[PDB]
Amino acid sequence: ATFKVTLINEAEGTKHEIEVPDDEYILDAAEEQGYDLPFSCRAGACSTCAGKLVSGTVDQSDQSFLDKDQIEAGYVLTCVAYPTSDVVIQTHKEEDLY
Ligand code: FES
Numbered sequence: 411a412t413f414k415v416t417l418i419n420e421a422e423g424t425k426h427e428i429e430v431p432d433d434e435y436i437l438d439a440a441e442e443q444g445y446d447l448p449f450s451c452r453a454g455a456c457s458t459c460a461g462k463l464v465s466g467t468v469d470q471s472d473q474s475f476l477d478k479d480q481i482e483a484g485y486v487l488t489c490v491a492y493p494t495s496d497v498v499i500q501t502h503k504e505e506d507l508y
Contacts, residue, residue, distance in 0.1 A: 413493040454490035466497030
């Protein structure tokens with residue numbers, strides 16, 4: 411399956427739509443399609459690539475930085491997240507983390 415991923419940059423007021431395979435991380439697909447997104451470690455262990463789910467689900471089982479409450483709040487590390495449905499996500503949310 412291939413899912414539609416809508417990327418929202420609130421501060422910029424931008425909206426970009428990408429198509430993501432069920433077996434590719436969102437960050438990788440975004441880059442391939444022309445959208446550079448923030449990142450550092452690329453391994454699920456930092457907060458640089460943090461995003462926030464608006465709608466849809468992901469599989470980020472490979473992540474290790476976010477605690478259970480943060481996940482519950484909708485936080486996602488884009489570098490190791492697979493979409494599991496069409497998704498709407500706000501990018502550049504690193505600052506929201508404490
Ligand atoms: S870039 Fe570090 S967790 Fe994604």
